[PDB]
């Protein structure tokens with residue numbers, strides 16, 4: 393069921409490269425995003441999908457140095473990210489947001505918020521789709537630190553605002569324990 | 584598959600009250616939220632689930648008047664919402680957000696954003712879960728207009744910030760046509 397699928401999605405930090413079908417994975421990622429809803433069907437999400445050489449480059453040449461060259465003013469956490477099969481960088485196209493604000497100024501204040509919600513939406517739908525394939529993932533946030541260098545290396549338009557980075561790969565160790573709130577404190581039903 | 588489930592979720596405006604098992608529906612809604620990820624497992628989402636009398640009250644006594652008593656300074660759109668089986672109001676608990684900002688001030692700026700993303704996440708997971716049950720839904724945003732009156736009528740804590748309202752019920756007419764972007768304009772793959 394769909395509920396079971398949601399349940400199978402978890403944060404997996406121990407990731408490897410035991411991935412059997414790269415293309416199938418890529419297609420699944422696109423689909424998860426394609427069939428995700430967005431305000432006005434604006435489809436503001438953008439993805440950079442890195443595997444192999446680019447995966448190593450992101451973490452060894454970009455994240456790590458900018459992290460270390462910042463602390464001044466890490467591993468083997470970074471080693472754990474690099475060791476994964478790939479990283480999916482989620483952006484939101486600010487250009488579309490601005491246009492929407494102009495075309496429909498009645499909702500100018502909303503589009504930014506709906507865009508943010510849209511990033512959460514596609515991020516978890518990809519995350520869950522990958523879990524269904526038996527692949528694990530975890531979501532990182534080294535934005536805005538690495539924004540500039542990522543755009544430069546992969547020639548991304550300036551309008552792509554980085555929101556998060558979903559590291560993914562083969563599951564090499566199970567998710568940890570997780571707790572839940574009391575239902576009574578977050579659900580109210582009235583008839 | 585999970586992809587199929589995502590695909591089955593659509594915006595349905597023609598809704599009715601041909602719902603067979605209210606309790607099963609309620610349980611499904613809770614589960615969709617329960618198994619949704621949130622930053623720091625903060626679980627900031629809160630739901631008010633209205634059916635029957637409360638459903639009618641929301642749209643007839645709250646939304647409509649405040650909408651009309653605002654325009655001065657509608658139907659049968661509102662009639663279409665009221666005609667549905669219920670409305671799920673999604674809130675984000677600002678109290679938890681603030682505490683997080685204090686406990687982890689290193690991420691003070693993030694929690695607000697992660698909270699917003701969290702609302703999108705649980706909203707679409709509920710939306711999709713309902714679709715799997717054969718029920719349709721559409722997402723409305725009469726916040727912040729109706730915030731105050733909703734809190735008053737159902738004695739909600741002030742800390743619950745309303746984010747959206749998902750009207751749901753039996754599908755009485757199919758979704759309209761929808762277009763998609765060119766893949767080339769929103770997906771970049773590098774290896």
Ligand SMILES: Cc1cc2nc3c(=O)[nH]c(=O)nc-3n(C[C@H](O)[C@H](O)[C@H](O)COP(=O)(O)O)c2cc1C
Nearest residue numbers: 429430431432433506509592593594722723724758
């Ligand atoms: C964050 C968000 C906000 C939305 N706001 C509204 C709204 O206020 N009123 C409405 O009727 N639909 C709203 N929509 C529905 C979208 O227009 C719809 O999901 C999109 O056009 C794709 O169509 P689909 O839901 O049938 O897949 C919203 C969707 C999202 C994800």
Ligand SMILES: Cc1cc2nc3c(=O)[nH]c(=O)nc-3n(C[C@H](O)[C@H](O)[C@H](O)COP(=O)(O)O)c2cc1C
Nearest residue numbers: 401402403531532533567620621622623624697700
């Ligand atoms: C919007 C959002 C932001 C998150 N930020 C991070 C992060 O920066 N680093 C990290 O390791 N996990 C992050 N998480 C993972 C959550 O802590 C995790 O989903 C939550 O504890 C529930 O655990 P689960 O993913 O195994 O279900 C984030 C999750 C969400 C939904």
Ligand SMILES: O=C(O)c1cccnc1
Nearest residue numbers: 430431432433499723724
């Ligand atoms: O198309 C939408 O998503 C929409 C419709 C009405 C109001 N706000 C957004």
Ligand SMILES: O=C(O)c1cccnc1
Nearest residue numbers: 532533621622623624690
């Ligand atoms: O637990 C989280 O979600 C988390 C972990 C590290 C950094 N930011 C968030």
